Amino acid sequence: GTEVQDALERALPELQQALSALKQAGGARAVGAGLAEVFQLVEEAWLLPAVGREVAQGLCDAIRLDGGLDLLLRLLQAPELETRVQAARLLEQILVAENRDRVARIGLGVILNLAKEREPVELARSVAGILEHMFKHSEETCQRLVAAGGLDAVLYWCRRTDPALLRHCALALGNCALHGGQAVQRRMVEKRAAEWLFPLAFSKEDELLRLHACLAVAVLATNKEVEREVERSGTLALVEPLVASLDPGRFARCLVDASDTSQGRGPDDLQRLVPLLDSNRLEAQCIGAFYLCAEAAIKSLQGKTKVFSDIGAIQSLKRLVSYSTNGTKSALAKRALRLLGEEVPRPILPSVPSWKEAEVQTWLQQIGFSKYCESFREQQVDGDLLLRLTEEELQTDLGMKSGITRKRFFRELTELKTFANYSTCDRSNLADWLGSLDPRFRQYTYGLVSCGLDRSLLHRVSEQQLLEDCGIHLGVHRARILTAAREMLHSP
Amino acid sequence: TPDVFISYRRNSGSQLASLLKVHLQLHGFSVFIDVEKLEAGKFEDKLIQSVMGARNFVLVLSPGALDKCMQDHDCKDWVHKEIVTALSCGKNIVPIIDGFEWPEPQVLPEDMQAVLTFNGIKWSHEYQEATIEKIIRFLQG
Amino acid sequence: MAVQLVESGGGLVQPGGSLRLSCAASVSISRIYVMAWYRQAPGKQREVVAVIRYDGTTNYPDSVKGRFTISRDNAKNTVYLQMNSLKPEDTAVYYCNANVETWGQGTQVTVSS
Ligand SMILES: NC(=O)c1ccc[n+]([C@@H]2O[C@H](COP(=O)(O)O)[C@@H](O)[C@H]2O)c1
């Protein structure tokens, strides 16, 4: 990986002198503008495609291993604020996880001694960015600042209208929610945070604001204790169509463009994103699948797709896709897997039409109707006859006299019938067409093929032919299948 | 039963309309707004529903608002639908002005002149508390 | 496809003792609809001991409520059956069953002194 360190061969030497002009001993108050000598360098070296990340922290580390950081704390004592505006933007880009702890140790009060000064728009960006990445350190620093006004300023800056300021505000609240555990998520809506997020999610100007605001509200929706507090805020109704509206391909296009989101994230921030896939709320699953598909598209342009294996995110994707009743979430999961190059699982269903008497007896042992395995053996039922049992055979010759036992049997039979494998007998693939209407409808497909019909010949049925031949008893199901069939009228 | 309706130009005058929405929700008022329609209010009972349920009416306007309902004199424009139905029902139209000047009443459609008598409020970006303390009055809802 | 299963465990336990069983499958367990275990006491016919379904719902016969627990482990491909309090009449050969057709070879379990 020579290239990686050859970029350090282009980068690192500029610091030989660039550390010395801020280490310049004499200085002037006009000469403080020198701070910029680094700033171009760290932006430049940040945005090198596919090598950027590796050299970024590898350039930023020099100021803490050897001493540079101290100055940025010792120079904030200047009374006039051009210097603070100029140097907190440098302090932004150098703030990596190995550099957050040096400020977390000492530098806590240093930060909040200017976060109270909310009126300068030119400074409020930097204020918001430092407060954004300071949430990544730990639970304790989050609690110590939320005891301070460290949430009040970003909660107040939702009133403001500057765009990059609102970008940093949405990411600061997302990092606070995602790394603050469960104690601070009650302090958030206790300080009425979930209601001030609506102007950000209702923005019609920048898509990034919308996505990060939906991330923050979906992470606060996982807190059961405050769930109906956040459900009256009004933003959850914007979470479902938005992910339906946007696609993550154009989102990856718009995420490699901007500077601070160009390269992408790291493994620490993304292992904390996988638990949104299995969570209870639909919106948590849909937004987790959105990002982790967009993020796969981001880092598939480079050769770094091997990060999703070790973080334990392709197993969750691979088990979330099969047996899932959510077309949107499964679509995003399949796009992520087929983008990463892995195979997409298909369920393994029992082949009921080819069953014989031994398997029918074993299934009767399974469902708890073991008292009848003799009678079903005397009449010799197999899979094909089990799929075509009606009430009179159960009532007369199989011996089921109690009507409740027939109800408690058919419940189990129709639960088996939706999860069968008719591929050995379904030519035109009628089962998937029936499942796309409603997953409960898949159970009828053997009744449509035992008579013989298929998707090409489906358009010439009558309701009276569905009722007496195909075994559909519920009138709602007949009506819905008719109105889905008629719509394609002499279509082909 | 929503207490106040909010009407806004679809592209501009949406963020600050959201600020008034949240600031009014902070004071406990049931408020309805329209999201993601794109002139889909051609249903003959959806406009009727939205305006009958409303008790008050807040015409938040953008710098450059009412450029569409101007030179129109037909019910096709949605904000024109809001104002004709609010005036036929006889509800108050309390507007809030931000960066916009009252246009000429002659180029203005000759049926919607009755809206020119309603008093408004200049919007303030830095003293939000004063404007929300003033706007909670004279809503009669 | 062909799903072949192997199961390990068993042997002898004192009455009032505990055992755990495994069942390794040739494919992923999260992929396959239903698994179950069966008891075949010598001289009688087979019966169910536990079933487990893809979402995680479990079902047991009334004779073995609380005395057995079945779980799915997805990191390594096994399903587990846990025996905790044992009776002398609970001796048999035990079978794993994937879906309803695939069988296993069974393991011997006896309980005495
Ligand atoms: N794509 C990125 O994550 C990116 C891009 C440019 C600058 N930065 C800055 O560099 C620092 C690195 O943060 P991470 O350690 O979370 O990657 C952050 O403080 C951020 O301000 C990050």
The contacts of residue A394 (CB under 8 Å, 6+ apart) are A400, A406, A409
Q: What angle do CA A18, A112, B16 make, to 5 degrees?
A: 105
On whether the CB atoms of residues C82 and C68 are closer than 8 A, the answer is yes
Fold assignment, C5-111? Immunoglobulin-like (2.60.40)
CATH of the domain at A391: 1.10.150.50
User: Buried b vs exposed e over A450-480: b needs ≥16 C-beta within 10 Å?
Assistant: beebebeebeebeeeebeeebbbeeeebbee
Q: What is d(CA A405, CA A239) in angstroms, rounded to the nearest whole number?
A: 45
Tell the residue nearest (CA) to atom 4 of ligand 1: A260
Cα A23 versus chain centre, distance? 45
Please report which residue ranges of A203-313 form alpha helices under DSSP H.
Answer: 207-220, 227-230, 239-245, 248-255, 267-271, 282-298, 307-310
Structure tokens at C77: 């491909």
A243 closest CA partner among A322, A166, A327, A337: A327
Classify residue A128 by burial, with Cβ atoms within 10 Å: 0-12, 13-18, 19+: buried
| Number of residues in chain B | 141
Is A345 part of any domain? no
The one-letter code for the residue type at B109 is: P
Provide the shortest C-alpha distance from residue C30 to chain A (in Å): 6
DSSP notation for A335-402? HHHHHHTPPPP--B---GGG--HHHHHHHHHHTT-GGGHHHHHHTT--HHHHTT--HHHHHHTS----
A400 assigned ligand-binding residue: no
On whether the CB atoms of residues A273 and A291 are closer than 8 A, the answer is yes
Structure tokens at C26: 């040739």
Is A56 part of any domain? no
Report residue A138: phi and psi, to 5°.
-160, 175
Domain limits for position A460: 430-486
Q: What is d(CA B69, CA B50) in angstroms, rounded to the nearest whole number?
A: 19
* Experimental technique used to determine this entry: cryo-EM
| Among C33, C38, C46, beta carbon nearest to A419 | C33
Number of H helices, E strands in chain B: 4, 5
Are A318 and C28 inside 8 Å of each other by CB? yes
Structure tokens at A382: 């197999």
Q: What is d(CA A238, CA A207) in angstroms, rounded to the nearest whole number?
A: 13
Is A478 part of any domain? yes
Q: Which of A370, A392, A417 is the last residue of a domain?
A: A417
Provide the shortest C-alpha distance from residue B22 to chain A (in Å): 7
Structure tokens at C41: 């006491």
Task: Name the DSSP letter for residue C45.
Answer: -
Q: What is d(CA A184, CA A177) in angstroms, rounded to the nearest whole number?
A: 8
On whether the CB atoms of residues C100 and A350 are closer than 8 A, the answer is yes
Looking up tokens 């240093």 gives A110
Asked if the C-beta of A346 comes within 8 angstroms of chain C's C-beta atoms, the answer is yes
CATH of the domain at A444: 1.10.150
Q: What is d(CA B82, CA B48) in angstroms, rounded to the nearest whole number?
A: 9
Asked if the C-beta of A365 comes within 8 angstroms of chain C's C-beta atoms, the answer is yes
Structure tokens at A33: 């503008």
Is A334 part of any domain? no
In order of A250, C41, C58, C110, the CA distances from C92 in angstroms are 61, 4, 22, 7
On whether the CB atoms of residues A350 and C99 are closer than 8 A, the answer is yes
Q: What is the number of CB-based contacts under 8 A between chain A and chain C?
A: 54
A277 closest CA partner among A220, A225, A218: A218
> How many angstroms does the Cα of residue A184 sit away from the middle of ligand 1?
24
A436 closest CA partner among A377, A371, A384, A480: A480
Domain residue spans in chain C?
5-111
The contacts of residue A265 (CB under 8 Å, 6+ apart) are A295
On whether the CB atoms of residues A128 and A150 are closer than 8 A, the answer is no
Is A470 part of any domain? yes
Q: What is d(CA A391, CA A389) in angstroms, rounded to the nearest whole number?
A: 7
Structure tokens at A188: 């958030």
Q: Is the dihedral of CA A355, A357, A359, A360 positive or negative?
A: positive
Q: Which of A417, A440, A459 is the last residue of a domain?
A: A417
Structure tokens at C14: 């004192």
Q: What is d(CA C99, CA A81) in angstroms, rounded to the nearest whole number?
A: 71
Chain A residues inside the 8 Å CB shell of C46: 362, 365
Q: Is the dihedral of CA A230, A231, A234, A237 positive or negative?
A: positive
Structure tokens at A104: 């977390």
- In DSSP terms, C92 is beta-bridged to C109
Task: Name the DSSP letter for residue B29.
Answer: -
- Largest separation between any pair of C-alpha atoms in chain C: 43
Expressed in Å, this structure's resolution amounts to: 3.8
Q: What angle do CA A10, A84, A212 make, to 5 degrees?
A: 75
B9 assigned ligand-binding residue: yes
- Sheet of strand C47-53, all strands in order from the earlier edge strand to the far edge: C11-13, C107-111, C92-98, C34-40, C47-53, C58-59
Task: Name the DSSP letter for residue A438.
Answer: -
The contacts of residue A18 (CB under 8 Å, 6+ apart) are A37, A38, A41
Same domain, A478 and A440: yes
Q: Closest chain B residue to A245 measured between Cα atoms?
A: B36
Element (H, E) at C68: strand C68-73
Q: Are strands B31-32 and B4-7 parallel, antiparallel or unpaired?
A: parallel
Q: What is d(CA A261, CA A53) in angstroms, rounded to the nearest whole number?
A: 11
Same domain, A407 and A442: no
Cα A182 versus chain centre, distance? 19
Q: What is d(CA A84, CA A117) in angstroms, rounded to the nearest whole number?
A: 12
Give the three-state DSSP class for C18.
Answer: coil
C49 closest CA partner among C107, C113, C112: C107
Are A195 and B25 inside 8 Å of each other by CB? yes
Report residue A154: phi and psi, to 5°.
-75, -30
Taking the CA of residue A96 as reference, the ligand 1 atom at the shortest distance is 15
Chain B residues inside the 8 Å CB shell of A195: 22, 25-26
The one-letter code for the residue type at C7 is: E
Element (H, E) at C53: strand C47-53
Are A159 and B19 inside 8 Å of each other by CB? yes
Tell the residue nearest (CA) to atom 20 of ligand 1: A93
List the chains bordering chain A where 3 or more Cβ pairs fall under 8 Å.
B, C
Number of H helices, E strands in chain A: 33, 0
Report residue B137: phi and psi, to 5°.
-85, 170
Selected residue of A118, A119, A158, A159 to mutate for chain B interface (largest B Cβ count, 10 A): A159
Structure tokens at A37: 């000598």
Give how many domains chain A has, as a whole number.
2
Structure tokens at B103: 């246009």
On whether the CB atoms of residues B75 and B84 are closer than 8 A, the answer is yes
The one-letter code for the residue type at C100 is: V
Structure tokens at B23: 């600031």
Q: Are strands C92-98 and C107-111 parallel, antiparallel or unpaired?
A: antiparallel
Chain A residues inside the 8 Å CB shell of B19: 159, 199
- Sheet of strand C19-25, all strands in order from the earlier edge strand to the far edge: C5-6, C19-25, C78-83, C68-73
> How many angstroms does the Cα of residue A251 sit away from the middle of ligand 1?
19
On whether the CB atoms of residues A35 and A22 are closer than 8 A, the answer is yes
Radius of gyration of chain B (CA): 14
List the chains bordering chain B where 3 or more Cβ pairs fall under 8 Å.
A
Q: Which of A369, A393, A417 is the last residue of a domain?
A: A417
End-to-end Cα distance, chain C: 43
Is A408 part of any domain? yes
On whether the CB atoms of residues A81 and A126 are closer than 8 A, the answer is no
Q: What is d(CA A337, CA A324) in angstroms, rounded to the nearest whole number?
A: 15
Tell the residue nearest (CA) to atom 22 of ligand 1: A260
Same domain, A440 and A383: no
Q: What is d(CA A154, CA A131) in angstroms, rounded to the nearest whole number?
A: 9
Same domain, A410 and A365: yes
- Backbone angle region of B70, left / alpha / beta, with phi > 0 → left and psi within -120 to 50 → alpha: beta
Element (H, E) at B19: helix B15-25
- Sheet of strand B94-97, all strands in order from the earlier edge strand to the far edge: B31-32, B4-7, B56-60, B94-97, B121-122
Is A87 part of any domain? no
Q: What is d(CA A454, CA A76) in angstroms, rounded to the nearest whole number?
A: 77
Q: Are strands B94-97 and C68-73 parallel, antiparallel or unpaired?
A: unpaired
CB-based contacts of C17-21 (< 8 A; 24+ apart in sequence): C17/C85, C17/C86, C17/C111, C18/C82, C18/C83, C18/C84, C18/C85, C18/C86, C19/C82, C19/C83, C19/C86, C19/C109, C20/C80, C20/C81, C20/C82, C20/C83, C21/C80, C21/C81, C21/C82, C21/C83, C21/C94, C21/C107
Structure tokens at A23: 């280490």
Angle, to 10 degrees, between the axis of helix A52-60 and the axis of helix A2-11? Answer: 50
Please report which residue ranges of A32-162 form alpha helices under DSSP H.
Answer: 36-44, 52-60, 62-65, 69-74, 82-93, 97-105, 108-115, 121-133, 139-147, 152-156
On whether the CB atoms of residues C68 and C81 are closer than 8 A, the answer is yes
In order of A266, A370, C38, the CA distances from A409 in angstroms are 53, 12, 21
